[PDB]
Tab-separated table of C-alpha atoms in Angstrom:
chain	number	residue	atom	x	y	z
A	1	UNK	CA	-36.300	-7.216	21.506
A	2	UNK	CA	-38.744	-5.885	24.027
A	3	UNK	CA	-37.368	-7.441	27.167
A	4	UNK	CA	-38.827	-6.692	30.677
A	5	UNK	CA	-40.400	-8.508	33.710
A	6	UNK	CA	-43.477	-6.330	34.618
A	7	UNK	CA	-44.926	-7.870	37.796
A	8	UNK	CA	-44.385	-6.774	41.413
A	9	UNK	CA	-41.592	-5.067	43.398
A	10	UNK	CA	-41.410	-5.276	47.170
A	11	UNK	CA	-40.825	-2.032	49.126
A	12	UNK	CA	-39.170	-0.790	52.352
A	13	UNK	CA	-41.299	0.032	55.391
A	14	UNK	CA	-40.890	0.656	59.129
A	15	UNK	CA	-43.580	-0.081	61.739
A	16	UNK	CA	-43.898	1.117	65.327
A	17	UNK	CA	-46.112	-0.597	67.934
A	18	UNK	CA	-46.801	0.684	71.466
A	19	UNK	CA	-48.491	-1.298	74.250
A	20	UNK	CA	-48.846	-0.126	77.865
A	21	UNK	CA	-51.579	-0.369	80.486
A	22	UNK	CA	-52.927	-3.959	80.692
A	23	UNK	CA	-51.542	-5.459	77.464
A	24	UNK	CA	-50.200	-8.916	78.508
A	25	UNK	CA	-53.760	-9.984	79.398
A	26	UNK	CA	-55.214	-10.304	75.862
A	27	UNK	CA	-54.123	-13.037	73.386
A	28	UNK	CA	-52.789	-11.376	70.159
A	29	UNK	CA	-50.379	-11.999	67.234
A	30	UNK	CA	-47.653	-9.635	66.035
A	31	UNK	CA	-47.218	-10.031	62.391
A	32	UNK	CA	-44.269	-8.087	61.482
A	33	UNK	CA	-41.903	-9.674	58.960
A	34	UNK	CA	-40.936	-9.760	55.261
A	35	UNK	CA	-41.495	-12.736	52.936
A	36	UNK	CA	-38.182	-12.104	51.075
A	37	UNK	CA	-35.634	-9.940	52.896
A	38	UNK	CA	-34.568	-9.991	56.570
A	39	UNK	CA	-36.080	-7.963	59.420
A	40	UNK	CA	-34.198	-5.664	61.817
A	41	UNK	CA	-34.883	-5.575	65.568
A	42	UNK	CA	-35.585	-2.169	67.161
A	43	UNK	CA	-33.559	-3.115	70.309
A	44	UNK	CA	-30.062	-3.147	68.760
A	45	UNK	CA	-30.439	-3.265	64.945
A	46	UNK	CA	-29.681	-6.994	64.872
A	47	UNK	CA	-30.840	-8.524	61.576
A	48	UNK	CA	-32.985	-11.627	61.355
A	49	UNK	CA	-34.075	-14.375	58.964
A	50	UNK	CA	-37.564	-14.644	57.462
A	51	UNK	CA	-40.469	-15.120	58.080
A	52	UNK	CA	-40.920	-14.829	61.892
A	53	UNK	CA	-44.560	-14.421	63.102
A	54	UNK	CA	-45.087	-13.941	66.864
A	55	UNK	CA	-47.818	-15.177	69.200
A	56	UNK	CA	-49.266	-14.315	72.645
A	57	UNK	CA	-46.205	-15.837	74.390
A	58	UNK	CA	-43.970	-13.345	72.495
A	59	UNK	CA	-46.239	-10.293	73.202
A	60	UNK	CA	-44.846	-9.450	76.700
A	61	UNK	CA	-43.046	-6.376	75.192
A	62	UNK	CA	-44.244	-2.766	75.497
A	63	UNK	CA	-43.041	-1.038	72.306
A	64	UNK	CA	-41.042	-2.019	69.246
A	65	UNK	CA	-39.689	-0.260	66.090
A	66	UNK	CA	-39.089	-2.882	63.341
A	67	UNK	CA	-37.850	-2.199	59.756
A	68	UNK	CA	-36.737	-4.209	56.690
A	69	UNK	CA	-33.096	-4.555	55.583
A	70	UNK	CA	-33.914	-5.032	51.837
A	71	UNK	CA	-37.371	-5.630	50.230
A	72	UNK	CA	-40.443	-7.250	51.820
A	73	UNK	CA	-42.966	-9.103	49.739
A	74	UNK	CA	-45.886	-9.824	52.134
A	75	UNK	CA	-46.774	-7.977	55.393
A	76	UNK	CA	-49.958	-7.273	57.450
A	77	UNK	CA	-51.086	-5.008	60.330
A	78	UNK	CA	-54.035	-6.558	62.235
A	79	UNK	CA	-54.775	-5.748	65.880
A	80	UNK	CA	-57.051	-8.796	66.359
A	81	UNK	CA	-57.199	-10.865	69.524
A	82	UNK	CA	-58.805	-14.022	70.915
A	83	UNK	CA	-60.609	-14.874	74.218
A	84	UNK	CA	-58.017	-17.052	76.040
A	85	UNK	CA	-59.364	-18.625	79.278
A	86	UNK	CA	-60.564	-16.116	81.953
A	87	UNK	CA	-58.498	-12.925	82.579
A	88	UNK	CA	-60.909	-10.443	84.291
A	89	UNK	CA	-58.969	-7.191	83.415
A	90	UNK	CA	-59.627	-3.836	85.192
A	91	UNK	CA	-57.247	-1.006	84.105
A	92	UNK	CA	-57.199	0.125	80.398
A	93	UNK	CA	-54.866	-0.734	77.513
A	94	UNK	CA	-53.450	1.777	75.086
A	95	UNK	CA	-52.466	0.525	71.630
A	96	UNK	CA	-50.743	3.037	69.328
A	97	UNK	CA	-50.136	1.522	65.908
A	98	UNK	CA	-48.349	3.557	63.197
A	99	UNK	CA	-47.087	2.032	59.912
A	100	UNK	CA	-44.635	3.962	57.736
A	101	UNK	CA	-43.675	3.347	54.089
A	102	UNK	CA	-40.221	3.937	52.561
A	103	UNK	CA	-40.037	7.553	53.861
A	104	UNK	CA	-43.650	8.564	54.841
A	105	UNK	CA	-46.538	7.887	57.292
A	106	UNK	CA	-49.526	6.047	55.751
A	107	UNK	CA	-51.470	4.285	58.543
A	108	UNK	CA	-52.099	5.546	62.068
A	109	UNK	CA	-54.486	3.887	64.585
A	110	UNK	CA	-55.026	4.220	68.343
A	111	UNK	CA	-57.097	1.895	70.583
A	112	UNK	CA	-58.003	2.679	74.231
A	113	UNK	CA	-60.977	1.217	76.167
A	114	UNK	CA	-61.983	0.197	79.761
A	115	UNK	CA	-65.684	-0.950	79.487
A	116	UNK	CA	-67.676	2.299	79.624
A	117	UNK	CA	-67.538	4.176	76.288
A	118	UNK	CA	-69.801	3.706	73.266
A	119	UNK	CA	-67.854	3.026	70.044
A	120	UNK	CA	-69.171	0.712	67.284
A	121	UNK	CA	-65.790	-1.083	66.853
A	122	UNK	CA	-62.964	-2.843	68.629
A	123	UNK	CA	-60.537	-4.121	65.909
A	124	UNK	CA	-58.439	-3.548	62.712
A	125	UNK	CA	-57.093	-5.619	59.785
A	126	UNK	CA	-54.764	-4.358	56.975
A	127	UNK	CA	-52.523	-6.167	54.400
A	128	UNK	CA	-49.547	-4.986	52.263
A	129	UNK	CA	-48.132	-6.906	49.275
């Protein structure tokens, strides 16, 4: 008589992505979903079954403000890309990537290049379960 289930407990989050400049010119993959509860679309607050992982085809949107209805289980935040045919590019991209927890700001990343600035990096990977 010592009766508990001590494992894991999923948690609320919100995430907020911003693309503008030349963004629909680079092949990337929006993970945002939950592996338990539904997701909620920043456009109208429609609510959506699970999981749903996007791809380059589904990346033609500027900015998006997604949040969980109940509790997530698995989530990730990875900016990574792939080299899809030619594309040339010229003008910059700005990526602003903020992840929030249940009531606070924990992860906050901004990308902006245009071939002509020395920085030792170009990408991010993060995982939350």
